[PDB]
Amino acid sequence: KEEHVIIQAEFYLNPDQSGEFMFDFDGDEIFHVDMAKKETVWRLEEFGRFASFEAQGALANIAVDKANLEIMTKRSNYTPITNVPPEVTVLTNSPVELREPNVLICFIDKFTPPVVNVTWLRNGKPVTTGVSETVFLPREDHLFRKFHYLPFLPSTEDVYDCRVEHWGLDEPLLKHWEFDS
Amino acid sequence: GDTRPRFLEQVKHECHFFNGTERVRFLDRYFYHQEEYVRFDSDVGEYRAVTELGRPDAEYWNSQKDLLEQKRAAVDTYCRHNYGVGESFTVQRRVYPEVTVYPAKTQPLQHHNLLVCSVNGFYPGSIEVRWFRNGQEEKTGVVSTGLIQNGDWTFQTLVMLETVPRSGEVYTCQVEHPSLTSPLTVEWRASSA
Amino acid sequence: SKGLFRAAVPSGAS
């Protein structure tokens, strides 16, 4: 079996008018193009010291993908995508000790289309401070996965949730986590 | 919230590497929703429709000589080239695991428990994790999560062991990984603390 | 020492 796989993955989605361009090495992201800022964004800052990417070239690809999409939509008799709702798992970066810096990871798996509303909740109230997310990552079955990250100091007093909205779900899905004692 | 029907184009240009770069396979794959409709596979050397929806594309693109020669060069111009650029921080990347051992349920002795071995932060994915009771490996009662990808160029795995500790016992979790030249070992001795 | 990643380009459909 094969040592490694490098996949350049693109999409465009209507009517959201939204698109992605990203590189992937064995299921981890090297970088993507922020279509908004028109900039290359390295998943790790270190990758940028070693390499480069002409972001304008990504945007051209996307325009071709948009124009193709229009054609494909017609050709299918305007048959739309079937929602596949996501699986969600929450886990810690390292094992949990009180007062010891850690990170909650929201793994959102096996869904399409690539639109999700995600929110970290601490005691039922949203938290943006210090958080981060990946773009939508390709899967071999042509669905998507995505991660979100929340830095936190563990506590007996706090509870946390990962609240995921997606059109394939009737209701928002919360995945719960709390200090385990 | 938004119940408007949606329409999705994906394109995946894939380079598969075997034995370093001594065999490379290039796939150019087009998707409508999740359905692959047309692909170019360097082993075939022309575009082939996967679904009837792709015939018009396979037939049109295969009539373009420059296009095909261009896709036929992709093993070198695209795949090997990019393998070159990224190799140093991808193929060569190695981060050490961190190993922590603890019981999951704070129970007394001669009572069932799960000793957890948590291995964290390592790259690449391949790893092996072994539990010993005294000096004897135990493959029975090993409950594992498997390889978990954290999405940030690190993995974890949690490997638990079903015990019934009595206090004259020592348990050890042993980790091997390409970043290490010797196993990381972590002990847990059976007592009240 | 600083290499450039090349993008593969999708073709325009019929």
Author numbering:
A (entry chain A): 2 to 182
B (entry chain B): 1 to 193
C (entry chain E): 27 to 40
The authors write:
The main established association between HLA class II molecules and RA has been correlated to the polymorphic region of the β-chain comprising amino acid residues 70–74 (12) that line the MHC-II pocket close to peptide anchor residue p4 and that is shared between HLA-DRB1*04:01, *04:04, and *01 alleles. In the present study, we focused on citrullinated α-enolase, one of the candidate antigens toward which a large number of RA patients develop autoantibodies. Both peptides take prototypic conformations, extending throughout the length of the binding cleft of HLA-DRB1*04:01, using residues p31F, p34A, p36P, and p39A to anchor in pockets P1, P4, P6, and P9, respectively.
Significant citrulline-dependent responses were confirmed only for peptide 26 (TSKGLFRAAVPSGAS). Interestingly, both the native and citrullinated versions of peptide 26 bound equally well to both HLA-DRB1*04:04 and HLA-DRB1*01:01. Comparative analysis of both complexes reveals that all HLA-DRB1*04:01 and the peptide residues keep exactly the same conformations. Comparative analyses of the crystal structures of HLA-DRB1*04:01/26 and HLA-DRB1*04:01/Cit26 demonstrated that the only structural difference between the two MHC-II/peptide complexes was the modification from arginine to citrulline at peptide position p2. The structures reveal that both the arginine or the citrulline project readily toward the solvent, with the tip of their side chains localized very close to the central part of the presented peptides and thus fully available for interactions with CDR3s, the most sensitive and specific regions of TCRs. The only difference between the two crystal structures is the side chain of the citrullinated residue p32Cit in Cit26, which similarly to the arginine residue in HLA-DRB1*04:01/26, protrudes toward the solvent readily available for interactions with TCRs.
